[PDB]
Amino acid sequence: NPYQRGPDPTEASLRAPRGPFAVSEQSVSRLSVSGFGGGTIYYPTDTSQGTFGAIAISPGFTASWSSLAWLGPRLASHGFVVIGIETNTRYDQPDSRGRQLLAALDYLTQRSSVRDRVDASRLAVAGHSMGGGGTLEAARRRPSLKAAIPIAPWNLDKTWPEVTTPTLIIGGENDSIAPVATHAIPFYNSLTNATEKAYLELNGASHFFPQTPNDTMAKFMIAWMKRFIDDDTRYDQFLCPPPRPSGDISEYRDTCPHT
Structure with a gap:
């Protein structure tokens, strides 16, 4: 697998604050950009391992990127490029949030200083609340996307x-x-x-669980991104067979096996 990166994973490394890759961050101004409000880019410092897949992440209604900023270095440290976006206006609806996520992926691959690092063919979307509704709208508008992760998603459209x-x-x-x-x-x-899908319900979690570092959210987010952006079968272990309900997991649904 040419997309494979990093050593064989461990549960502890998935829960650890940082993966093996060292990360660097580039700021992006609202004025320097078209189609979204700017943001922050997190990338592996190591040029040698190879080009890496990328994910665009959107915050929810009335929120800034800092409300989810811990995800940037955490995800990137496992071998991904992350662009966390600010929205055009804080009142932007989910449909607008989805198109802005796509514009952020366009800026990252086409114009950004880190574009050479990213493989433009392997991209993903994620988001919180209306940002979560937005990642579904982005997946609707761009089927070429390799992965989608709505987090506590909010959308009036249910289908x-x-x-x-x-x-x-x-x-x-x-x-x-x-x-x-x-x-x-x-x-x-x-x-x-959806070619494959999963539902992860966090035990006793409020709407604002993503605003604080959560290891279980990070573990399954990383394993899903590895499996589907990188085609990395070594991470299927955590996804399949499906996890049973536990301390952090109140319920889990999945379409195992992943063929």
Whole structure:
């Protein structure tokens, strides 16, 4: 596998604050950019290992990138390029958030200083709340995307049969802002055309679980990104067979096996 990066994973390294790769960050101004409000780019410092896949991450309603900023160095340290975006306006709806995520992936691959590092063919989207609804809208508009990770997603549109991208939805059991019964689970069941999908429900988690570092969220986010952006079968272990409910995991749904 030419896309394979890093040593054979361990559970502890997945929960660890940093993966093996050293990371560097580049700021992006709102004025220097078209289609979104700017953001921050996190990348592996090591030129030698090879080009790396990339993920664009969007915050929710009224929030800035800093509300999810811990994800940038954590994900990138495992061998990915991350662009965390600021929105055009803080009142942007999920549909607008999805198009801005796509514009951020365009800026990163086409114009950014780190474009040579990124493999433009292997890209993904993630987001929190309306940003989570946005990653579904981005996956709808760009089926070439390799992975999609809505986190506590919020969207009025409940039906997503157009998505073919492997999608992992992460929900909080006790979420009252975007309740999983009305948002996350309807999204999951409607993804009748996703090549693979999974639903991860975090035990006793409020809507704001992504605003703080959470090892279980990071572990499955990294394993999904490795499996589908990098085609890395070494990480399928955590995804399949499916995890059973535990201290952090109240419920898990999946489409195992991953063929």
